[PDB]
Design a protein around this ligand. Structure first.
Ligand SMILES: C[C@@H]1CC[C@@]2(OC1)O[C@H]1[C@@H](O)[C@H]3[C@@H]4CC[C@H]5C[C@@H](O[C@@H]6O[C@H](CO)[C@H](O[C@@H]7O[C@H](CO)[C@@H](O)[C@H](O[C@@H]8OC[C@@H](O)[C@H](O)[C@H]8O)[C@H]7O[C@@H]7O[C@H](CO)[C@H](O)[C@H](O[C@@H]8O[C@H](CO)[C@@H](O)[C@H](O)[C@H]8O)[C@H]7O)[C@H](O)[C@H]6O)[C@H](O)C[C@]5(C)[C@H]4CC[C@]3(C)[C@H]1[C@@H]2C
Ligand SMILES: *[C@@H]1O[C@H](CO)[C@@H](O[C@@H]2O[C@H](CO)[C@@H](O)[C@H](O)[C@H]2NC(C)=O)[C@H](O)[C@H]1NC(C)=O
Ligand SMILES: *[C@@H]1O[C@H](CO)[C@@H](O[C@@H]2O[C@H](CO)[C@@H](O)[C@H](O)[C@H]2NC(C)=O)[C@H](O)[C@H]1NC(C)=O
Ligand SMILES: *[C@@H]1O[C@H](CO)[C@@H](O[C@@H]2O[C@H](CO)[C@@H](O)[C@H](O)[C@H]2NC(C)=O)[C@H](O)[C@H]1NC(C)=O
Ligand SMILES: *[C@@H]1O[C@H](CO)[C@@H](O[C@@H]2O[C@H](CO)[C@@H](O)[C@H](O)[C@H]2NC(C)=O)[C@H](O)[C@H]1NC(C)=O
Lengths: 457, 469
């Protein structure tokens, strides 16, 4: 209907991004008055971005997502890079961060005032990964009956923060870090650090670049969908902006930049029945972000192996218990390669930089489609005031995050330059010596012997 | 798209593969139990971290002494209700206390006509003092009252019989303490016979109300054994004195003065105040105030300061000013006796704008005391150096570890690194970056080597190095 199609936009934008973002959007924003503006601005700048993706997704009624939208506007080169980055970086490091915030929420009740053993962290993300792969490589009915208990884990963690913040404002004070008595801006930021807050405050808002076109094909609400995303995303900013309020009414910001696991120190500085409720029901929530982002990747292998690329060794199906066994192993191997980093907040900046590289190009593709080739039958048409303020918000968010730390954002522009030699020999090559083609024939067929998978019909 | 079909594959499914799969499928459950047993064996091999010492409220910050309320604001605004216009300034210093002057009634040296149970009318009233305590708890600043009954005459303890000086005090230690005051102050106990049992019957009842109360006792001695005669039984009393206020002017004396004072009493909590109630401009010469602020903000203890020590409020650089209570120079109009006498470098707003001033250094240092963990309740270990340099390291178990080296000498010294007093956990690295220096000649945050450290006369350093893994 309308509310149940509003509930499956709030019910999945909420995730495990709120449990590691307030340690990151507070250090780079300097103070707490500027760290609540960033939680307000990026909620508003995304309803610009979600109103825009509804427009391109209704005049090009295709399936697959953003990979289907660059190919119909830009060339064959720029369309392929969206499939090629989202299978190499943005999926293997949207589950290398939600696996690393599982280890930090299980060691922190044991190592409170000492930073944990660093080489014992990675052996707790290579157990959350390798158990959730084998569960997702078994029958697909197992991959949903436990998913809706990792909503029950996430919701009990977030309803307990949303209630204990109501008590602390009725039993304690009113707005303790307000600009009348308290709240000095003692470390005032500038050009570089105030833009690095929008790259960690936009990790908790993932889940709309594909997660709105899977809504209209169940009940068909008939173009109430832009009216269904004006009451959804302010219902997810008000939950997000009141949880960060409920942290600073229970601890100091000298401590919120000290602790590695944010929700477990808030959990222990309030209540006497601890360590079976707060670090339990967050480690149950980051299981449903490493499970829900593995079988999300399966619908990119399928739609990627249709047009020209992502060859037929991938996108196969187990003959019984139909699950893509040689496709899930491509992310599960490439995630464990991305666990060699000595931090986590330098992987949130690595994802969010190139995640905004494609949130600007596929919105600038609208302006080209609005200028070149106009007059298409369009059900829902939006103002031009909206996609021009995104193009300037995307403008100063990349030139300011490149002038600061040009190494983690300096290889995000170096992966996408490897694809230009890759899109020189995939479908752009003459088969005269016939030597290299038959090896591609070889490892494809023996993989059908190693696992029993076949092609779909 | 060069693949095999489905029905072509199920014929090609060989019994040589069903052993190849079931052996490889068993390798995953071995490699996963080989990574779960390796994680629990490293969560107990990893060294644990030490428990907190469970500090009280006077372990942070620096207690602030306020002697005379009339000399603090000035004339006209010298009432007690005018003090609430200054709590917005004391929280700029991040000061965790307020030692308030004696506000009781005594005319002049009169044993009979005095009472510590009511407020004198020359400052405010009972409804005025409780209006002050509304804003003290509002900004997280605790107050302490000075209980010295004969605070006008020379003998501050009523040189007649000693019965009436012990029966109205116990009324004042209950009546004022019910109102919500945060501790009590009492001074000049050299003019008090059998004072060790006088304070013990006051220390037992002060902690007897609540645990977070405390007593500040102050002598004027300089003897190591006289204060241990007072601290022989009360090992929770914060005893200030004049022990560090000798002539000295050598680096090896104060190094031997603070190592012998700690080691004789162990590692208990003390109060690193230079005087009983006087200012730092009377026991020091001119260009040494900027060095003792680093020294009193790093020794293990609660530094106690009087009003004006953060700017250099001098009484010898201005004739016609009382030694008991000089005025506080807020602006050029705070001293209306001679126009042009005061200047831009003895005022509040002038020192609050120059970042290399003295008030800028007192605000830079107290923020590095009320937020740290190594300077809050760390460990103190001194170096056995050569000439008159005082250097020491401060470390908690795994937080960032602070280093301080300072030149008491009037010549340019060298580094003189001395390890091997410390355990193997706390070692000195080759590189350690600066954080704060008294004489500004360098760039903050510019690291340098330890063995190539060349110090300038009358300067100090605050070095930070992380936990060298
Ligand atoms: C099969 C595919 C292949 C491709 C791929 O997928 C799989 O592979 C993946 C994997 O391979 C990934 C990489 C894994 C490793 C990652 C590392 C990470 O940090 C980098 O770490 C480097 C380590 O070599 C450099 O760090 C410097 O390393 C030098 C040695 O080479 C040191 O010399 C120097 O420190 C200096 O040493 C001498 C002292 O006197 C100085 O005082 C000190 O500065 C370090 O620099 C320090 O590096 C730290 C991290 O190690 C911090 O960045 C720190 O930050 C600064 O600290 C100061 C302290 O005073 C502070 O003031 C300042 O503000 C801070 O900024 C910075 O000093 C570099 O520079 C720093 O960036 C980087 O970010 C991203 C990173 C490469 C990742 C990017 C993405 C990938 C490629 C992935 C990629 C998709
Ligand atoms: C405060 O109260 C008294 C005063 O010193 C002490 O408590 C105990 O009092 C009894 C009196 O019968 C003594 O016998 C004990 O020795 C006292 N406690 C000791 C010394 O252990 C003590 O000073 C304070 N109270 C406590 C419990 O320490
Ligand atoms: C405390 O200060 C006084 C004043 O300078 C020192 O002088 C003593 O004062 C007391 C009475 O206040 C006399 O009984 C002593 O005889 C004085 N001493 C001398 C040297 O004459 C006093 O010595 C100081 N206290 C200490 C412990 O030194
Ligand atoms: C302060 O520390 C010193 C040195 O650690 C102590 O001197 C030691 O005293 C004991 C008892 O006589 C001797 O056995 C040791 O040999 C002394 N030290 C060394 C290593 O020579 C001193 O006792 C401590 N405090 C005081 C003065 O009591
Ligand atoms: C304010 O600071 C300045 C500079 O430190 C002082 O000017 C110097 O004061 C000393 C005091 O003995 C003189 O020896 C110097 O010759 C002065 N230098 C100059 C260039 O005049 C100034 O005196 C300070 N303000 C006051 C009132 O003392």
């Amino acid at each position: 209907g309308l509310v149940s199609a509003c509930g499956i936009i709030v019910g999945n934008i909420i995730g495990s991004g709120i449990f590691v973002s307030p340690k990151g959007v507070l250090e780079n924003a300097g103070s707490v008055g500027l760290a609540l503006i960033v939680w307000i601005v990026t909620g508003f700048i995304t309803v610009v971005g979600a109103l825009c993706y509804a427009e391109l997704g209704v005049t090009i009624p295709k399936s697959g997502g953003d990979y289907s939208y660059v190919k119909d506007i830009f060339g064959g080169l720029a369309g392929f890079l969206r499939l090629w980055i989202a299978v190499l970086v943005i999926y293997p490091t949207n589950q290398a961060v939600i696996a690393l915030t599982f280890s930090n929420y299980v060691l922190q009740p044991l190592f409170p005032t000492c930073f944990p053993p660093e080489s014992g962290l990675r052996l707790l993300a290579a157990i959350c990964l390798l158990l959730l792969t084998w569960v997702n490589c078994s029958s697909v009915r197992w991959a949903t009956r436990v998913q809706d208990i990792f909503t029950a884990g996430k919701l009990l963690a977030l309803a307990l923060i949303i209630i204990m913040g109501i008590v602390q404002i009725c039993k304690g004070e009113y707005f303790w870090l307000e600009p009348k008595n308290a709240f000095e801006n003692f470390q005032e930021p500038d050009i570089g650090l105030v833009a690095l807050a929008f790259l960690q405050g936009s990790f908790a808002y993932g889940g709309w670049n594909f997660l709105n076109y899977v809504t209209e094909e169940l009940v068909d609400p008939y173009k109430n969908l832009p009216r269904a995303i004006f009451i959804s995303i302010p219902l997810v900013t008000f939950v997000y902006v009141f949880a960060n309020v409920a942290y600073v009414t229970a601890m100091s910001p000298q401590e919120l930049l000290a602790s590695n696991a944010v929700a477990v120190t808030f959990g222990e500085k309030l209540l006497g029945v601890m360590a079976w409720i707060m670090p339990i029901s967050v480690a149950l929530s980051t299981f449903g972000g490493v499970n829900g982002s593995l079988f999300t990747s399966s619908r990119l292998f399928f739609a990627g192996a249709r047009e020209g690329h992502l060859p037929s060794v991938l996108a196969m199906i187990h003959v019984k218990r139909c699950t893509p066994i040689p496709a899930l192993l491509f992310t599960c191997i490439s995630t464990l390669l991305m666990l060699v980093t000595s931090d986590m907040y330098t992987l949130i900046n690595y994802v969010g930089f190139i995640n905004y590289l494609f949130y600007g190009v596929t919105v600038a593709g609208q302006i080209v489609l609005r200028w070149k080739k106009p007059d298409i039958p369009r059900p829902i048409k939006i103002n031009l005031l909206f996609p021009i303020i995104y193009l300037l918000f995307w403008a100063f968010l990349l030139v300011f995050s490149l002038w600061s730390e040009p190494v983690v954002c300096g290889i995000g522009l170096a992966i996408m330059l490897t694809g230009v030699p890759v899109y020189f020999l995939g479908v752009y090559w003459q088969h005269k010596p016939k030597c290299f083609s038959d090896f591609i024939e070889l490892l494809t067929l023996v993989s059908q012997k190693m696992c029993v998978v076949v092609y779909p019909e | 798209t060069g693949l095999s079909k489905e029905e072509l594959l199920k014929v090609a499914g060989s019994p040589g593969w069903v052993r190849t799969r079931w052996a490889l499928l068993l390798l995953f459950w071995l490699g996963w139990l080989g990574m779960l047993a390796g994680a629990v064996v490293i969560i107990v091999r990893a060294p644990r971290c030490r428990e907190l010492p469970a500090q009280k409220w006077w372990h942070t910050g620096a207690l602030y002494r306020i002697g005379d309320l009339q000399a603090f604001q000035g004339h006209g605004a010298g009432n007690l209700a005018g003090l609430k216009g200054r709590l917005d300034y004391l929280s700029s210093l991040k000061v965790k206390g307020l030692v308030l002057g004696p506000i009781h009634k005594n005319q002049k040296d009169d044993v009979a006509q005095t009472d510590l149970l009511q407020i004198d009318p020359n400052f405010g009233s009972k409804e005025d003092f409780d209006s002050l305590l509304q804003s003290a708890k509002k900004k997280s600043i605790r107050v302490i009252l000075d209980l010295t009954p004969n605070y006008r005459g020379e003998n501050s303890w009523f040189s007649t019989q000693v019965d009436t000086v012990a029966t109205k005090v116990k009324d004042a230690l209950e009546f004022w303490l019910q109102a919500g005051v945060d501790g009590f102050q009492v001074r000049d106990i050299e003019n008090l016979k059998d004072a060790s049992s006088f304070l013990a019957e006051w220390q037992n009842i002060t902690k007897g109300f609540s645990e977070d109360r405390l007593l500040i006792a102050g002598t004027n001695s300089s003897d190591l054994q006289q204060i241990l005669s007072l601290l022989e039984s009360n090992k929770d009393l914060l005893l200030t004195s004049s022990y560090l206020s000798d002539s000295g002017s050598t680096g090896e004396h104060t190094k031997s003065l603070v190592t012998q004072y700690l080691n004789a009493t162990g590692n208990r909590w003390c109060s690193w105040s230079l005087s009983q109630a006087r200012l730092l401009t009377s026991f020091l010469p001119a260009q040494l105030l900027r060095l003792y602020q680093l020294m009193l903000f790093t020794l293990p203890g609660t530094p106690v300061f009087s009003y004006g020590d953060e700017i250099g409020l001098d009484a010898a650089a201005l004739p016609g000013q009382p030694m008991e209570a000089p005025v506080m120079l807020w602006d050029e109009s705070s001293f209306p006796d001679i126009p042009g006498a005061v200047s831009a470098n003895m005022t509040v707003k002038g020192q609050s704008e120059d970042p290399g001033s003295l008030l800028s250094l007192f605000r830079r240092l107290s923020d590095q005391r009320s937020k740290e963990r190594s300077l809050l309740h760390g460990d103190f270990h001194a170096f056995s150096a050569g000439p008159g340099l005082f250097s020491y390291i401060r470390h908690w178990d795994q937080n960032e570890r602070f280093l301080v080296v300072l030149n008491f000498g009037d010549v340019g010294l060298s580094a003189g690194l001395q390890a091997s007093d410390l355990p193997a956990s706390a070692s000195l690295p080759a590189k350690a970056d600066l954080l704060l220096s008294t004489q500004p000649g360098r760039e903050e945050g510019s690291p340098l080597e330890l063995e190539r450290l060349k110090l300038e006369p009358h300067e100090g350093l605050l070095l930070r190095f992380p936990y060298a893994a």
